[PDB]
Amino acid sequence: STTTKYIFVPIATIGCGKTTVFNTLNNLFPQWTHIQNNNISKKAKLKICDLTLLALEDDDQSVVLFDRNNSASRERRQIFTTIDQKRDEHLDDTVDLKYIAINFIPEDLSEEELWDITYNRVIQRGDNHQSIKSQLDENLVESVMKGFIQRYQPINTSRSPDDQFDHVIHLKLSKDENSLKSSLENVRIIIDDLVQNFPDLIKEKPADELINECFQKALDYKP
Ligand SMILES: O=c1[nH]cnc2c1ncn2[C@@H]1O[C@H](COP(=O)(O)OP(=O)(O)O)[C@@H](O)[C@H]1O
């Protein structure tokens, strides 16, 4: 009769944990399609929005993890506008699409600490963002990361375009201290939020051993 499907839209800069968190969630929930802008050729005729809608055509798909930074408000505007315009090419009128913002940069986080956490993650642990995956020029890494931060516009659901989100999940971002890693905390935040608010997506919280193992795999993942 009627189906609701979801597009999880991150708002992040480089090294905030976006790919790690989405890889963890896909490890846990293989039916949640993880579409990585970083892996799409720029001559490809199917761009991330096209692949998103193709994925949502499948009856077995309920969630697309839309893996792109979307640090600028114009980038969020593009998702809403393009998906809204193109969905009729792909989906019948019994499918309701909901957009879930996954906010990776807390309002309370200073730009200095955003830089401190993310730049040192990228240099110490690596990042597969294509323009910086080599890191043969640490000046280039700094310059690209600064570009995303310069363009970053915090989520604001009291105005266009972010008022089009149906739900926002607020993540944490902090320096690693002892065994604590904010990306694993954030996986749990997402799972708990969906268990409570979207039981159609997670009827029962997975065992903690499995959540932690899926996170370990994502943390260790090299492509
Ligand atoms: O909570 C964390 N603590 C420490 N390092 C992390 C955490 N989450 C991800 N990382 C590491 O940070 C680096 C950047 O990962 P991220 O998921 O931010 O990539 P992204 O820029 O493609 O979204 C990776 O080497 C990853 O393993």
Swiss-Prot record:
Organism per entry: Candida albicans (strain SC5314 / ATCC MYA-2876)
Protein family according to the UniProt entry: Belongs to the TRL1 family.
Protein task: One of the two proteins required for the splicing of precursor tRNA molecules containing introns. The ligation activity requires three enzymatic activities: phosphorylation of the 5' terminus of the 3' half-tRNA in the presence of ATP, opening of the 2'3'-cyclic phosphodiester bond of the 5' half-tRNA leaving a 2'-phosphomonoester and ligation of the two tRNA halves in an ATP-dependent reaction.
Section covered of the full-length record: 408 to 630 of 832
Name of the protein: tRNA ligase
Record note on domains: Has three domains each corresponding to an enzymatic activity, namely in N- to C-terminal order: ligase, kinase and cyclic phosphodiesterase (CPDase).
Domain of life of the organism encoding this protein: Eukaryota
